[PDB]
Nucleic acid binder design. Structure first.
Length: 764
RNA sequence: AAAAAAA
């Protein structure tokens, strides 16, 4: 039900001086007064209600407000510094040239409760109020997008920033970060049509780009569909002065009431609202809407000291300590970043294979395959290469050499490719793949892999994967034609990493000598993530080794945009059933890693998902009562950590080193959480993964779980690196994403995977 | 779809 109290802060790893974009807030101890605001009509969006309050605050200065300046939620909440005569109800107010406004007093918001909640005794309404104060004035000036703000200097990038009030130990802080987002450019639709008579293929793409967007007339209409018929032919039921309803072409209607004759009658019409039709000549896309979905990569990113400068530049630009509404309440936001002292954990040694074994020691989150080979190499006796690019643009000599080098490296990689390709084909057409794909497994018993080669963007990868893992059960490895003409000793080396484990092999295992005490008993590791598009796809992956290296995946479909997992009881049980079949043991502890859950869903996710993970254990045996560790991981937060000393920055990114852990200062005051940069930053500013532990029966310490989380990120089997999140939560992302390429019993039947592929990691 | 990182 409720999260556990933080056990400790731990003492592991070397200390490092850092900075965070958390800015301390000097909060007064006065009370805040909340007022509900019911305005008619209630249909108006966020921005208009803020203008209504903005107009009535000046209008009724003598009547009700006076010296005070009120902050506005944007909907139905209004906080003030000191009380108003409005208290006890009631005032009904008009806004002149139509809105009737009602200001009703609610309750007093005591700020000391926060000053007390950070030192014993977490009132959401108080933190809800402090954000409204800081959010209010930037909402006036800039265009708000969720929590972030943006301004205006066929997509277009708008540079803005993010703002949020977050609680921390002993005090309150303000989180600010530079943010950029793609926005649909304020274009006339005719140029929006131009930038993306129309053919059915020419037309159907435009409908995908503009559906659900808002346009104006040369009113506010949200587009629903793009007509098949042009303006000169599309009709609508027009009534006449007589009363009878004749059919009228949309081109001729503008020719009568609006005196406008269309220049582009051959183009279709934007359907707005039903029964309304608008041609493309008179429509401009509404400015200020976030885009739903190379040049965008150059504007984004920058060194970590570069981003650290922009946040401080922006902190100078806003100057929150001189914000008239922040002045009214007395809040003071420090102009300096918060100094935090993190800890860099030791990376676990990694045992490789072959008779020469070896011990890879990761430095800056990287090691190499050099003078090493696989812990459990899989010698491939036979396989079938199937290139899908023509010998007009490819040649046997490529594949004669591509396999020549590939065989040479797998010889060094520990999975010796001793056989030779049973056949080597050229085949084109996504449809003819399946008939060929059927004929290859029958010709060769003990067959393993099929190296299909795919040139550029193509939906054949969807069918090669759909027919590959769900039906017949053969292994499948894809590679672009761009990588068969050019073979560097690493492009092929990362391939042998994926292929070996996809054939049941073990590329590497953590040093068992140096391992936390949670491995003294049998323990299973789970990862879950939901990817939304109609149906949301949920995947749950479970540990199968005690190393732990090999995993197994279960993926289901569920309600559109649903973040909870109802089939968690079914999937965890099925996952944990496969654990006994492979390990011969029952896992004493379940370590659940959950991804994609915001704190607004913590009480909703933990309640159901922990009960489902307990329903899974109880269906096995009446007394199978292991310990559940519920860990929500977060990568889409906004916390940033920068190095105080230039002698600790790593690479051109200037980012923090791998294994940087933070328990103090900027974490949740009472509960148990921490930020952990398991990886090293190659590009831009690193975003350290945050782990909030909602349930823990296993009685973990802060150290042991932080080291366990760090060690699991090394166990990724697709690169010689540490990664963003632990491998279970990472593998869950692949599986739910792999099910997307599998295109209502048939959907679950399409997402269901074959038995022989379910044996190991088809997804890696 | 060699891979990680970056929105």
């Amino acid at each position: 039900f409720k999260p556990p109290p933080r056990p400790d802060f731990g003492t592991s790893g070397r200390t490092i001086k850092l900075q965070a974009n958390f800015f301390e807030m000097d909060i007064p101890k006065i009370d805040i007064y909340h007022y509900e605001l019911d305005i008619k009509p209630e249909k108006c969006p966020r921005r208009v209600n803020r203008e209504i309050v903005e107009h009535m605050v000046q209008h009724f200065k003598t009547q009700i407000f006076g010296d005070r300046k009120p902050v506005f939620d944007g909907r139905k909440n209004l906080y003030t510094a000191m009380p108003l005569p409005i208290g006890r109800d009631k005032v009904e107010l008009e806004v002149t040239l139509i809105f009737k406004v009602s200001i009703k007093w609610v309750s007093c918001v005591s700020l000391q409760a926060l000053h007390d909640a950070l030192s014993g005794r977490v009132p959401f309404e108080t933190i809800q109020a402090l954000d409204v104060v800081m959010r209010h004035l930037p909402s006036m000036r800039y265009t708000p997008v969720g929590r972030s703000f943006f301004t205006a200097s066929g997509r277009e990038v708008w540079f803005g920033f993010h703002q949020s009030v977050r609680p921390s130990l002993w005090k309150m802080m303000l989180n600010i970060d530079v943010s950029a987002t793609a926005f649909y450019k304020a274009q006339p639709v005719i140029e929006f049509v131009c930038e993306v008579p129309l053919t059915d293929s020419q037309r159907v793409k435009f409908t995908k780009e503009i559906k659900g967007l808002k346009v104006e007339i040369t009113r506010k209409y949200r587009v629903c569909n793009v007509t098949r018929r042009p303006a000169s032919h599309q009709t609508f039921p027009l009534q006449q002065e007589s009363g009878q309803t004749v059919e009228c072409t949309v081109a001729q209607y503008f020719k009568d009431r609006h005196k406008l004759v269309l220049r582009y009658p051959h183009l279709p019409c934007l359907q707005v609202g039903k029964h309304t039709y608008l041609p493309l000549e008179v429509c401009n896309i509404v400015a200020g809407q976030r885009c739903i979905k190379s040049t965008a990569a150059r504007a984004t990113a920058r060194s970590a000291p570069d981003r650290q400068e922009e946040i401080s530049k922006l902190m100078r630009s806003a100057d929150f300590n001189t914000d008239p509404y922040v002045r009214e309440f007395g809040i003071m936001v420090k102009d300096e970043m918060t100094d935090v002292t993190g800890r860099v954990l030791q990376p676990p040694s990694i045992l490789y294979g072959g008779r020469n074994k070896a011990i890879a020691t990761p430095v800056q989150g990287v090691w190499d395959m050099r003078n090493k080979q696989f812990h459990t190499g899989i010698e491939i006796k036979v396989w079938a290469i199937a290139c899908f690019a023509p010998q007009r643009q490819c040649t046997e000599v490529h594949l004669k050499s591509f396999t020549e080098q590939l065989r040479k490296i797998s010889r060094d990689a520990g999975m010796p490719i001793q056989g030779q390709p049973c056949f080597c084909k050229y085949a084109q057409g996504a449809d003819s793949v399946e008939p060929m794909f059927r004929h290859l497994k029958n010709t060769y018993a003990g067959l393993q892999l099929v190296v299909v080669i795919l040139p550029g963007k193509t939906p054949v990868y969807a069918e090669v994967k759909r027919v590959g893992d769900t039906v017949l059960g053969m292994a499948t490895q894809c590679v672009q034609m761009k990588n068969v003409q050019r073979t560097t000793p690493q492009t092929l080396s990362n391939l042998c990493l994926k292929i070996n484990v996809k054939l049941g092999g073990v590329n590497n295992i953590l040093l068992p000598q140096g391992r936390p005490p949670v491995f003294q008993q049998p323990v299973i590791f789970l990862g879950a993530d939901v990817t939304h598009p109609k149906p949301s796809i949920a995947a749950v992956v479970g540990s199968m080794d005690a190393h732990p290296n090999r995993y197994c995946a279960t993926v289901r479909v569920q309600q559109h945009r649903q973040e909870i997992i109802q089939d968690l009881a079914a999937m965890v049980r099925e996952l944990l059933i496969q654990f006994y079949k492979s390990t011969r043991f029952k896992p004493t502890r379940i370590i659940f890693y959950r991804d994609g859950v915001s704190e607004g869903q913590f009480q909703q996710v933990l309640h159901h998902e922990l009960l489902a993970i307990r329903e899974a254990c109880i269906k096995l045996e009446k007394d199978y009562q292991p310990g559940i560790t519920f860990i929500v991981v977060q990568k889409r937060h906004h916390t940033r950590l920068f190095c105080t000393d230039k002698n600790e920055r790593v690479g051109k990114s200037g980012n923090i080193p791998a294994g940087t852990t933070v328990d103090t200062k900027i974490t949740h005051p009472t509960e148990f959480d921490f930020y952990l940069c398991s990886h090293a930053g190659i590009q831009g500013t690193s975003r350290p993964s945050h782990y909030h532990v909602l349930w823990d029966d296993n009685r973990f310490s802060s150290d042991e779980l932080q080291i366990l989380t760090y060690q699991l990120c090394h166990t990724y089997v697709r690169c010689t690196r540490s990664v963003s999140i632990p491998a279970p939560a990472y593998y869950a992302h692949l599986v739910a994403f792999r099910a997307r390429y599998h295109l209502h019993q048939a959907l679950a039947k399409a997402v269901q995977v074959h038995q022989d592929t379910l044996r190991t990691m088809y997804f890696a």
